[PDB]
Design a protein around this nucleic acid. Structure first.
Lengths: 94, 46, 271
RNA sequence: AGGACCGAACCGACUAAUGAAAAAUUAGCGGAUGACUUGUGGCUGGGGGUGAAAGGCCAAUCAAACCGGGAGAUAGCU
RNA sequence: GCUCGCCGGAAGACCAAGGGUUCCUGUCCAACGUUAAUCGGGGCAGGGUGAGUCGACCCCUAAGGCGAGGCCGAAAGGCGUAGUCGAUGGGAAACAGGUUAAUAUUCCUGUACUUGGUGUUACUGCGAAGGGGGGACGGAGAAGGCUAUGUUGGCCGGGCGACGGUUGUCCCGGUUUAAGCGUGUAGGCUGGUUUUCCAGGCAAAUCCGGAAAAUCAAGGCUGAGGCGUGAUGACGAGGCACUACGGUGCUGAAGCAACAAAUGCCCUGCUUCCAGGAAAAGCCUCUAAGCAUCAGGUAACAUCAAAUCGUACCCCAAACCGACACGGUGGUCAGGUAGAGAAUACCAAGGCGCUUGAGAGAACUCGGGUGAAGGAACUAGGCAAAAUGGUGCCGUAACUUCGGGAGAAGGCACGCUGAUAUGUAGGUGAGGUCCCUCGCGGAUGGAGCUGAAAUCAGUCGAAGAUACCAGCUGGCUGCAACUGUUUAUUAAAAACACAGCACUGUGCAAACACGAAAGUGGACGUAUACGGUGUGACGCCUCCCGGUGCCGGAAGGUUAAUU
């Protein structure tokens, strides 16, 4: 049982990319940016409540931040957690 | 030719890392000194 | 028996094996085993405290019974076994109550021999009883110095002690060194000589053998530089000084016993 | 069987000629089941360690490591 | 794109360590790249790392670390008990195919497995900080059984030749398929089952150990591979539709047999040797306190569960350690022909041509090739080159510690073809036939397959161990017995070490060593042991105690604090 408030905080964004699109189309799997602390179960819960859609399974991974250079000064982008969430057969997501 | 530095992360940490430094009085002193100096990287710890 | 090995290579030429067939060809009694890691002759400070120790073969520790307290229960000798931890051979015995122990194998002992500890026990080889009960003139081994402690004198491959006298609460032992020593008469002792008496006839025959026995090589002080040893230095071979340890103390002759606490027990020093 | 033999890997470094290289090259050379070799981790600390002993080795530094301090040592010398 | 060349026990493929975006795409060429650069490991932007079963975490411990109390120490702190950490070791579980520009045992497809809860019905002794078993272990050697893998034939598809021949004993390609589940084999280990008692296993034990007694000779454990299923599937040479020339979608034959065969597996086995070969948990089992008709245990079945972190890419290197796009770096994989071979030569798969080129064809330098006659005259020195170089057989001195010396030396044979023998000796081994406690069984049988070595006869060349590969040999002699070790980076030796020898200390709270100490090593050793010193295999051997040391003596002389 995850708290409503917690759930709302978990899910950061949808991730747009070719791969993501492919996943959505073929495998019925949505690619989300989620909180770095968000566990799989929590993510699933969030998905179910907040998008109103049955979840088969969630795979997560941590994306490491790229090191960049703004002019002369070096600086690193933040790490962030990506989640492939596979929706059950016949579940169409808006 | 096998040069002197042959890196190993665990070894480095055990040797020089924060916890090791903390463990002894002299280590602590070193840390303090570093702090005083204004070091950004207080220890070898990443 | 001793066996001079045929010189099919140098390093085998001068080898003499001591091959006893009556030893157990097999894995030892595992309950009585325990771990025994190597020092390298280095103490808790991590410094080398005794030179020339290092390496050699992994060895288990057989838990030998030197206290020898199963009084009244007769044991029977199951087998003789190789112990890597000592010059003697050990013997796995089986008490009538089902317990097993290792003991130093004495001279005549073999599989099937019955042995017994206690005051009542028969004065025969391998039997153990207090030296007040043991007849004067007898050869004993595995001799306790303090009652109850465990055998400390005469444990090595072909050693034994003579009970020369029993004067009241003490008995006088003629130790293998030639030292005559008073010992409390209630101290325990095992009848006969300890076993593996042709141990001294073995000859290692090569450098490697020594190494295998955990003995690193020994450098001569005279081969060193003066900063290292008192004998060091000299152009060519010089040695114009009285022999001494690496720590400057005389080596040829100078006595080093300082124990004033046990001077009373020493009847006569060895010669 | 063997600190056995011939010989690749592997470990070494006797001869030779010759910066890519703050010790290498190519051609040969020694050991190659052992007192062998190697990975990972551990322990020994400076008049201290370790040393099959050459004053060798102890982070390209060793008849006393490096870093900081006494310290602007002292310099009848340049 | 087509040729050419190089690596191929790597200059290929996959990891660890280390790095940390170098990966992929688009875009830009100032700088960086030893030249140019449209290219890049460079700049900028975007994308990319998907796990119950791989690894970490986790449970367990080794060396070692920390260490409540504690012992010790001016202080700081040292050592260490209980404990708790610490992998490089022990501990549950996944395979095949398909897919991305870039991930995959992680996605998808198929087919699996694991150990937890929870609930069940069925049963009914459960229970640990304790007991026992197990885990649990060395070197070498030898086979035998296997597979990986390869070769040939069969089969299936395609081919009929740019130049003489090529419808055949011809040519090219393919002929692949897992874990799991079932079977429990080659083979290895052990005698089982029941009963009774017992000073043992810190207490108890129905467990282990020990005693008896009965009865049956098969009982159990282990075990590669094969076979079956998994699989009416998947993959499949290439054909066929579309084409953003990148590829996408459909489709799909055969898919067998024999022989050879590992250094891999059975094997943590067996045999043997002495130098005598981790630990703890998981796992099995036994009970105690306990609880007692409850919990807990095992039984299947249902359901839920398996979080977290790593996953790109380089990894003998242009990405790690070397200031560089410059030598070092642990593991795994190991095709063909020749060969003893992981050597060597040429090749496969795959990967590269080393980020300045173009000419010229002087001296001189480097790295190679050949050389008349002579053959060490060179030189400090045959330094360097040259030479020797294989297998089999014959043959082989002094001296010797009887092992050696010895590959001593020195010689002969060596290709191809045919025959012996349309392929032998051997190896393997199908049908058939017989037996049978029935199976992965035993006999007999020899088809097919594979296949040396030799002899005889012929034959070609200047030359048959034809290339690469691959000892120079002998004689006298110093030193060190020997194998070893050593000045990282001018010294590898006659130096150090060595087995052996001798002296000497040391009676165990050992001498000695590291420690203001506690303590630790010596050693869980005990004089056949340990320390120190010298000598240095083996053989024959090996006067002086005045000096300096050490050992013993203590009559006298001298002699401190103290008084």
């Amino acid at each position: 049982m995850i708290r409503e408030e917690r759930l709302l905080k978990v899910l950061r964004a949808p991730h747009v990319s070719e791969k993501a699109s492919t996943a959505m189309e073929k495998s019925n799997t949505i690619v989300l940016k989620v909180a770095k602390d968000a566990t799989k179960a929590e993510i699933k819960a969030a998905v179910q409540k907040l998008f109103e859609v049955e979840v088969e399974v969630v795979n997560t991974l941590v994306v490491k931040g790229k090191v960049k250079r703004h002019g002369q000064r070096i600086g690193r982008r933040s790490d962030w957690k990506k989640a492939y969430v596979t929706l059950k057969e016949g579940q169409n997501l808006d | 030719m096998k040069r002197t530095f042959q890196p190993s992360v665990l070894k480095r940490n055990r040797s020089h890392g924060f916890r090791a430094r903390m463990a002894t009085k002299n280590g602590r002193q070193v840390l303090a000194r570093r702090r005083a100096k204004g070091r950004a990287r207080l220890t070898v710890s990443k | 028996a001793v066996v001079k090995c045929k010189p099919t290579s140098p390093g085998r030429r001068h080898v003499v094996k001591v091959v006893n067939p009556e030893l157990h060809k097999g894995k030892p009694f595992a309950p009585l085993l325990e771990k025994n890691s190597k020092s390298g002759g280095r103490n808790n400070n991590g410094r080398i405290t005794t030179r020339h120790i290092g390496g050699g073969h992994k060895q288990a520790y057989r838990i030998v019974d030197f206290k020898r307290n199963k009084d009244g229960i007769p044991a029977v000798v199951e087998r003789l076994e190789y112990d890597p931890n000592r010059s003697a051979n050990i013997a796995l015995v089986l008490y009538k109550d089902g317990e097993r122990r290792y003991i130093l194998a004495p001279k005549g002992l073999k599989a099937g021999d019955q042995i017994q500890s206690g005051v009542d026990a028969a004065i025969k080889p391998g039997n153990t009883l207090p030296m007040r009960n043991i007849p004067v003139g007898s050869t004993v081994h595995n001799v306790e110095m303090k009652p109850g402690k465990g055998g400390q004198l005469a444990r090595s491959a072909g050693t034994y002690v003579q009970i020369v006298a029993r004067d009241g609460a003490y008995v006088t032992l003629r130790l293998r060194s030639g030292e005559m020593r008073k010992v409390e008469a209630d101290c325990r002792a095992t009848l006969g000589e300890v076993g593996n008496a042709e141990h001294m006839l073995r000859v290692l025959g090569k450098a490697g053998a020594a190494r295998w026995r955990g003995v690193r090589p020994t450098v001569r002080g005279t081969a060193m530089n003066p900063v290292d040893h008192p004998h060091g230095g000299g152009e060519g071979r010089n040695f114009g000084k009285h022999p001494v340890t690496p720590w400057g103390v005389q080596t040829k002759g100078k006595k080093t016993r300082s124990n004033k606490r046990t001077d009373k027990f020493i009847v006569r020093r060895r010669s």
